[PDB]
């Protein structure tokens, strides 16, 4: 399927929810949020991905940890845009769906910003992760 | 069935390539390009739409004209994304295909920018036009 550019840096380890997205539509967004976003974990159908970020509690040496945030999506709700500020890492992430405008994860949005529109809704994410979210790529449904 | 939101302003006259797109998949992008994009005209199979923009040669009373640019797509190549900067009008357009990022039409990229994913490839465009491209909407295969 069509995908965005990779937004972020070369650190961390690769992840790609492609296989996991066979479990279903994205039904939930879980993130960990402070001044930056420190992990992302989507739910595909009823199956969560692994925790992409906050690799271990020692990560507190390099950023704050943040609060777990959960946004449940209803059936027929899908993510239609993502506003990402980023450089070497993803800094902040603001998702919108066809029903809701969700709050930004990462109170600091000072890095360069990109708005990705996903008509018909996001299918899955890929990127790179470690102590935080090194980068993200958005995959459309077709 | 899926299409992007409308990007641009309320001026000009509405246009829609839905009917002409029955002639086939897009094979060519023709635009006119200066500091801004002043027209667009896609080819659907072997058939072109009308020229959407630069209505009259007297449009120099308001804006610059620019040079014709043609991107020929290979067999099976499809348009997967557009970076659009826009305000009252479409300012610049950077198309991407499943094979390559193409040159931007419009050297100025200062207005609001969005990266539109076009799931399954672009099927056709609609929008509004007059002396320039007041706005565009991207109609995907998916």
Number of domains of chain B: 1
Structural Rg of chain B: 14 Å
Amino- and carboxy-terminal Cα gap of chain B:
6 Å
The chain pair forming the largest interface, with residue counts per chain, is: A-B, 17 and 21 residues
Estimate the helix proportion of chain A, in percent. under 10%
User: In angstroms, what is the radius of gyration of chain A?
Assistant: 14 Å
Q: Count up the domains of chain A.
A: 1
Principal-axis shape of chain A equals globular
Biggest sheet overview of chain B? 5 strands, antiparallel
Find the structural class of chain A using helix and strand composition.
mainly beta
Enumerate how many helices of chain B there are, as a single number.
0
The percent range for strand residues of chain B is: over 45%
Terminal residue distance of chain A: 5 Å
Q: What amount of the residues of chain A lies in strands?
A: over 45%
What is the number of beta strands of chain B? 12
Number of helical segments of chain A? Answer: 0
Order of helices and strands of chain B: EEEEEEEEEEEE
* C-alpha geometry of chain B: globular
Largest sheet of chain A: 5 strands, antiparallel
Q: From the helix content, strand content and strand pairing of chain B, which structural class follows? A: mainly beta
What's the order of the H and E elements of chain A?
EEEEEEEEEEEE
What does this 3D model show about the protein?
- It is classed as sugar binding protein.
- Keywords: Lectin, Biomineralization, Post-translational modification, Calcite, Docking simulation, sugar binding protein.
- It forms a dimeric assembly.
- The complex is a heterodimer of chains A (142) and B (142).
- With 142 residues, chain A is mostly beta strands.
- Chain A has one domain.
- Helices cover 0% and strands 49% of the residues of chain A.
- Chain A is built from no helices and twelve strands.
- Chain A has strands at residues 7-8, 13-16, 26-33, 37-44, 47-48, 52-53, 67-72, 79-86, 90-97, 113-117, 122-129, 133-140.
- In chain A, the strands form three sheets. In chain A, strands 3, 4, 5, 6 and 7 form a five-stranded antiparallel sheet that branches. In chain A, strands 1-12-11-2 form a four-stranded antiparallel sheet, with no helix packed on it.
- In chain A, strand 11 and strand 12 form a beta hairpin.
- The termini of chain A are close together.
- Chain B has one domain.
- Chain B is globular and about 40 Å long.
- Chain B starts with 6 loop residues before the first strand and ends with a strand.
- Chain B is an all-beta fold.
- Chain B contains no helices and twelve strands.
- Chain B has strands at residues 7-8, 13-16, 26-33, 37-44, 47-48, 52-53, 67-72, 79-86, 90-97, 112-117, 122-129, 133-140.
- The A-B interface holds A 1-5, 81, 114-120, 138, 140-142 and B 1-5, 80-81, 98, 113-121, 138, 140-142.
- Strand 10 (113-117) of chain A pairs parallel with strand 10 (112-117) of chain B.
């Amino acid at each position: 399927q069509v995908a965005s550019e990779y937004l972020g840096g070369p650190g961390g380890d690769a992840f790609d929810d492609k296989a996991l997205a066979q479990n279903g539509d994205i039904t939930r967004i879980e993130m960990q949020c402070t001044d930056v976003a420190t992990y992302i974990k989507l739910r595909y159908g009823k199956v969560d991905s692994r925790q992409w970020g906050w690799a271990n509690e020692n990560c507190i040496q390099w950023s704050k940890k943040g609060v777990k945030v959960v946004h449940e999506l209803s059936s027929g709700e899908y993510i239609t845009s993502a506003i990402v500020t980023y450089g070497k890492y993803v800094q902040s992430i603001t998702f919108k769906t066809n029903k809701r405008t969700l709050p930004r994860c990462g109170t600091s949005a000072t890095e360069k910003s990109v708005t990705v529109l996903i008509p018909g809704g996001l299918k899955y994410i890929s990127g790179r992760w470690g102590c935080r979210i090194d980068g993200l790529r958005f995959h459309a449904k077709c």
